[PDB]
UniProtKB/TrEMBL annotation:
Source organism: Streptococcus pneumoniae serotype 4 (strain ATCC BAA-334 / TIGR4)
Residues noted as binding dTMP in the record, renumbered to the chain: R39, K50, G51
GO terms for MF: DNA binding
Protein's name in the database: Transcriptional coactivator p15 (PC4) C-terminal domain-containing protein
GO process annotations (BP): regulation of DNA-templated transcription
Phylogenetic lineage: Bacteria, Bacillati, Bacillota, Bacilli, Lactobacillales
Full-sequence portion shown in this chain: 11 to 77 of 79
Residue ranges constituting the Transcriptional coactivator p15 (PC4) C-terminal domain according to the UniProt record: 17-64
Length: 67
């Protein structure tokens, strides 16, 4: 019903006592070209938590606004 693949790891923002991390990655969902993805991950990255996927245009819009 759904697949994911971390194609590139870009940045970790924090890690908690359980080893879960908040990361910015390029992630391919359902085989689509990889997109920016800001999300919590288990230590071995086989479980994911809540997060948001952003197009390149959305991510650029965000960075340019807050730089």
């Amino acid at each position: 019903e759904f697949t994911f693949e971390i194609e590139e790891h870009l940045l970790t923002l924090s890690e908690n006592e359980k080893g879960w991390t908040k990361e910015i990655n390029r992630v391919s969902f359902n085989g689509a070209p990889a997109k920016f993805d800001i999300r919590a991950w288990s230590p071995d990255h086989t479980k994911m938590g809540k997060g948001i996927t952003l197009s390149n245009e959305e991510f650029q819009t965000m960075v340019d606004a807050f730089k």
